[PDB]
Amino acid sequence: GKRLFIIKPSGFYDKRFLKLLRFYILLTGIPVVIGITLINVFIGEAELAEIPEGYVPEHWEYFKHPIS
Amino acid sequence: SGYTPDEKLRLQQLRELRRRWLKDQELSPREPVLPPR
């Protein structure tokens, strides 16, 4: 009576798209961030030492980050 | 001058129709919206 019929265009398609977008980013938003969290809180990054006396390293063991 | 009576007749029919439309826009089933959950 007091509240008339407001006329909004449509909302269902837009809310469906944003629901699908947040759900299908949230599907791998939680595990990837949790995995990189577990990496930089458990396995540790690296340490600052040099090449020892007469020794050959690999082409890795040059990089601070372990996933790198 | 003024209206021609054809315009008066036409306009009074549009009075009735436009009042019926705008009253029909006024909803009150005691509940406009309803969430199913």
Side-chain angles (χ1 to χ4, degrees):
Chain A
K2 181 70 174 68
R3 53 185 296 165
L4 296 172
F5 183 80
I6 197 166
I7 302 169
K8 291 178 72 174
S10 65
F12 180 75
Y13 296 97
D14 195 3
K15 295 293 185 180
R16 183 177 67 186
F17 175 72
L18 264 67
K19 184 186 289 183
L20 288 170
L21 187 65
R22 63 97 177 173
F23 184 74
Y24 285 146
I25 294 168
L26 197 282
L27 190 145
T28 53
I30 302 298
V32 181
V33 172
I34 284 179
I36 191 173
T37 305
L38 298 182
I39 291 300
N40 62 7
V41 85
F42 285 111
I43 202 65
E45 294 181 356
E47 291 181 355
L48 284 74
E50 296 182 355
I51 294 172
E53 300 175 354
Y55 181 76
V56 286
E58 292 293 326
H59 66 279
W60 65 84
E61 294 177 352
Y62 289 162
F63 297 145
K64 294 178 182 179
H65 194 77
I67 300 176
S68 179
Chain B
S1 66
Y3 284 170
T4 63
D6 295 331
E7 292 171 353
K8 291 182 180 180
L9 185 65
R10 189 262 204 281
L11 193 64
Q12 289 176 357
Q13 280 113 27
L14 266 65
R15 291 286 81 80
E16 184 67 29
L17 295 175
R18 185 65 173 85
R19 289 177 189 271
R20 287 179 66 246
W21 180 260
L22 186 53
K23 182 182 284 186
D24 199 0
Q25 296 296 317
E26 184 175 1
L27 83 164
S28 178
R30 293 180 181 178
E31 49 95 19
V33 301
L34 53 95
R37 292 182 180 179

